[PDB]
Amino acid sequence: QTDPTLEWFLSHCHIHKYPSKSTLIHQGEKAETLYYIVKGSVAVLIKHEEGKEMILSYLNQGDFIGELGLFEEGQERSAWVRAKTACEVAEISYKKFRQLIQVNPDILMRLSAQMARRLQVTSEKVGNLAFLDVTGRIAQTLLNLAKQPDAMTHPDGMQIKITRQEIGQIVGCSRETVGRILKMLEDQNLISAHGKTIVVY
């Protein structure tokens, strides 16, 4: 589902394909381009020497990406953005976009609605990490990604596909610890695990 405005915006971009796991944005690169996911999904990650990679968020079709450096020249990509599946994404220079903004501010309103949402979601994440114990953090995380578009409904909850590695990267724990906690969450009858498939209740 799309609309005129959106299509108007798109007719000003170049759509490029990206195989699963390929990197769309490298942290540190000069920020001079805006992106738009027409198809597929991506992960946004940050790195910290020792411990390594952490997943800030998943973004999907309809999501803008690479927008954080738009309002001030000379900024660096604040994160790594990698394809989680085959992706088709539009791109336009900040300059051309700042122009379309003047033509029709609605395009900025749509981008802004998403930034506001991201700030609400990232803030909630900040709190969960500071206030929840590792158990609650993982328990909540399973609820969140159960809210993702790729989540398949279960005749008694919601079914998701995730790795102990990904969970650990979202909550900030090792896959070993995640496994041990998933065991408890299963025992406590809160989830059902079968391979890399989890059924959240």
**Residue 113 contact among a second copy, ligand CMP, none, beta carbon within 5 to 8 Å by kind:** a second copy
Query: Can you read off the two tokens belonging to residue 189?
Result: 């009858």
Q: How far is the CB of 61 from ligand CMP (least distance, A)?
A: 15
- Which positions from 9 through 28 interact with ligand CMP, judged by CB under 6 A? 25
Determine contact, residues 91/14, Cβ cutoff 8 Å.
yes
Determine contact, residues 25/40, Cβ cutoff 8 Å.
no
Should residue 118 be labelled a site residue for ligand CMP when binding is judged by CB under 6 A?
yes
CA distance 67 to 119: 13
Should residue 119 be labelled a site residue for ligand CMP when binding is judged by CB under 6 A?
yes
Should residue 190 be labelled a site residue for a second copy when binding is judged by CB under 8 A?
no
Burial of 155 (0-12, 13-18, 19+ CB in 10 A): exposed
Should residue 69 be labelled a site residue for a second copy when binding is judged by CB under 8 A?
yes
Should residue 128 be labelled a site residue for ligand CMP when binding is judged by CB under 6 A?
no
Nearer to ligand CMP, 57 or 157 (CB): 57
